[PDB]
Design an enzyme around this catalytic site. Structure first.
Site, PDB file in Angstrom:
ATOM      1  N   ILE A 136      63.523  36.058  -6.650  1.00 41.42           N
ATOM      2  CA  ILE A 136      62.954  35.285  -7.745  1.00 41.42           C
ATOM      3  C   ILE A 136      63.173  33.836  -7.397  1.00 41.42           C
ATOM      4  CG2 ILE A 136      63.167  34.726 -10.174  1.00 41.42           C
ATOM      5  CD1 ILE A 136      64.314  37.673 -10.531  1.00 41.42           C
ATOM      6  N   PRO A 151      68.337  38.219  -4.658  1.00 47.58           N
ATOM      7  CA  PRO A 151      67.463  38.458  -3.464  1.00 47.58           C
ATOM      8  C   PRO A 151      67.729  39.801  -2.897  1.00 47.58           C
ATOM      9  CG  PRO A 151      68.313  36.262  -3.416  1.00 47.58           C
ATOM     10  CD  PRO A 151      68.968  36.894  -4.541  1.00 47.58           C
TER      11      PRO A 151
END
Lengths: 114, 114, 114
Positions: free
Chosen positions: C64, C1
């Site tokens: 993701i 992240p």
């Protein structure tokens, strides 16, 4: 809406009141209430456009809705106009990326807009 | 195409000619003429990667098309290579977000690319 | 992240330890190892929110996966919390754009995550 402009024009060349002008004109163009418009101008950047360091801008407009083919043409005319009039940047040295945000993907005030 | 690099490497560590090198190599990689490539390097940033502040980069490549699995692996090899050779950033401390923009979602020259 | 904060709060007002705190809190919130979290704080910015230059922040969290309706509400409470406690920014003057990135669209370590 959130509008970001990154430019190699120096800070002194950004005229007083420019953030308010952008706010006003974006509220009008998008139809969104001015309290929801955020604007961010980042001068003095190390940038090139077409290999050239002449004045240029890389921008982004993200909005929950109000993004589409015709609307984005309108925004581009408005915003390139403002960048040319106020910052002396040629329209053909500006890119503006448009982002249609889902309401669930925008956080504000400890929650999201969903 | 537009490539942005945000890094904690200091401005003086960005070598002369780097924006042109990026422009040239991105033109080759994407296949697009260099006149259409814009590049933007933002040094001196307050950043951490995995909890530490050694040299790192957060980057973005946005393009109208020319984005996909294989292509993005190629771009990653290229761009991590450049960042390691030129800015001395370890490839494992680089993230590059890839964005395939719709032509109607990119403003330029008072209109869009649609 | 990867979490990016752009703010008009001055650099001196960013507490020592803030990048580490965000790293830790994001690792807990997203469930991802800290080694994969990157954080980036950009103070001193020329920005306005609702036409006002009172303290504000424009932020982005790209990951993701681990993005969605409920998760993003939680992240918003967390991160508005932190920005209010640490930077003294009102939650109602913070936007956070969330991006659920495809693994093939994130470059790292000479390749992608796919």
């Amino acid at each position: 809406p959130m509008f970001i402009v990154n430019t190699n024009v120096p800070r002194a060349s950004v005229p007083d009141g420019f953030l308010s002008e952008l706010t006003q004109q974006l509220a009008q163009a998008t139809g969104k209430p001015p309290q929801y418009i955020a604007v961010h101008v980042v001068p003095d950047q190390l940038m090139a456009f077409g290999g050239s360091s002449e004045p240029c801008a890389l921008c982004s407009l993200a909005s929950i809705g109000k993004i589409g083919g015709a609307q984005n043409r309108s925004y581009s005319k408005l915003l390139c106009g403002l960048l040319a009039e106020r910052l002396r940047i040629s329209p053909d040295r500006v890119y503006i990326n448009y982002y249609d945000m889902n309401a669930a993907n925008v956080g504000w005030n400890n929650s999201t807009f969903a």
